[PDB]
Amino acid sequence: ADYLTSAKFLLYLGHSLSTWGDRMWHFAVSVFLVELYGNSLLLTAVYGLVVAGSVLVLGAIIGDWVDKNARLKVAQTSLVVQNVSVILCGIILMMVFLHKHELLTMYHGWVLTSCYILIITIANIANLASTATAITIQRDWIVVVAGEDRSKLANMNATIRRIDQLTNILAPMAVGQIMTFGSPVIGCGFISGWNLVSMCVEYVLLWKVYQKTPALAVKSQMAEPFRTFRDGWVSYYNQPVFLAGMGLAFLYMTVLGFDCITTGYAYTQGLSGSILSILMGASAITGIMGTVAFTWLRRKCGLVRTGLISGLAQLSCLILCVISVFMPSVPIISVSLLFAGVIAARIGLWSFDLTVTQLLQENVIESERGIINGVQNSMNYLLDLLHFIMVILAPNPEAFGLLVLISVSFVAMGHIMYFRFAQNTLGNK
């Protein structure tokens, strides 16, 4: 059973533990946001805005720093900074949850504002570190370990996304179960301890996987941040894969979510918790099946053809969504159609995203991958920021139809731009 010691499985374990810690972290942040502060749209809105803006402005420099330094060093640097930030913030959660009642009651004033600024800043640092580590490990290490065998690379990406989805659906359940059985303070203590132990394990694990893959080793004073930012963006514009990334960034502006807890608008309206649980489970299962579908389609049709098929599937499913919303309380039929539509739009979106990830990992000169992926994430979060602004501009329940129409339109635009890329790079169907 040498598969247990092969760098493949070791890397899957590393990504799995990192994602598990991150998902516990995000669920705990949401529990803080809701238990202390009421279900207020603007708190979550400003949280998302701060995170998205910081990653937007820092993606190019993060990618440049990833590319310039050694893969090993940047890998554990990002890992350690992420884990220390999450541990410190888990300690802060311990203190605040142990002070929930009297913070709400005895001493009003700026204490809530101070704790919320601290939570958002440390969460933003943690998410920046998560973006850095995701870029470096996924892109560079996956492409190098997979080598020139592109089927193995596709399997790598697909199984990574499956692990991501299974974590996203299980970790919130585990954190909720333990927190209910104990107390929020116990939940936060457990999360902090688990992040610590996972930090140690993943440090050792990255050291191990580095050994087994020798190919990784071969590889105003603020003027230089702007020069690097401009150089990275212009390099990304010249990259022939620009259209696919642009369309993916468009696809990340959809309002039909049910993806995670930090990003959601059904809860913004106020839907019941059981329905959200069922929708999240269906979305996770459908995303896993979508990864399977992308694996199956890449072998039969071309990679660009696979992306195009995913695009048509996703677009037609959102056509089903817009038919559902356009139909004349509300009948159960319309809501059921909208729910099935978002669930199958999920499979379309994930097949498309795996395809675009494959293109990005494939068509880079390998001297520039970090910067290209960093600006890719910056664009993704830029259109996520516009998504957040659009949500902010329409709190009213009597705007959901317009919001859905806008999201479908932007999805269509993204797939049209990917279609332009397909025409450019094939000229054959």
Partner: nanobody, 120 residues
């Protein structure tokens, strides 16, 4: 997200009466609302149920038919119309919400309670 209900009191047996639950922080069309009875000397019992998504009711077996429940999204409230009130109906009514919260973090929220008594 505190909720308040009013309209309790005393009516002759076999009469009719109407409790009105007014809710503020949460929708009363996207969350399962139910009613419970708190009779003296015994623990609480289930009255009726409105589903979260559809307008379908799940009245209790013992009191089925003779109770009616209806939600109103415009006024942001839910109603119970009572008919043919019997002496065993004397109890304290609790307006509640089940399964409100996160995708995987949700609770049950309760009202202050109103006294409804039946005399013969």
């Amino acid at each position: 997200v505190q909720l308040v209900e009013s309209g309790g009191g005393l009516v002759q047996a076999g009469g009719s009466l109407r409790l009105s639950c007014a809710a503020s922080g949460f929708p009363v069309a996207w969350n399962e609302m139910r009613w419970y009875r708190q009779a003296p000397g015994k623990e609480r019992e289930w009255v009726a149920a409105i589903a979260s998504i559809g307008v379908t009711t799940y009245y209790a077996d013992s009191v089925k038919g003779r109770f009616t429940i209806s939600r109103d999204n415009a006024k942001n409230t839910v109603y119970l119309q009572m008919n043919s009130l019997k002496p065993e109906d004397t109890a304290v009514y609790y307006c509640n919400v089940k399964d409100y919260g996160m995708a995987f973090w949700y609770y049950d929220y309760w009202g202050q309670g109103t006294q409804v008594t039946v005399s013969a």
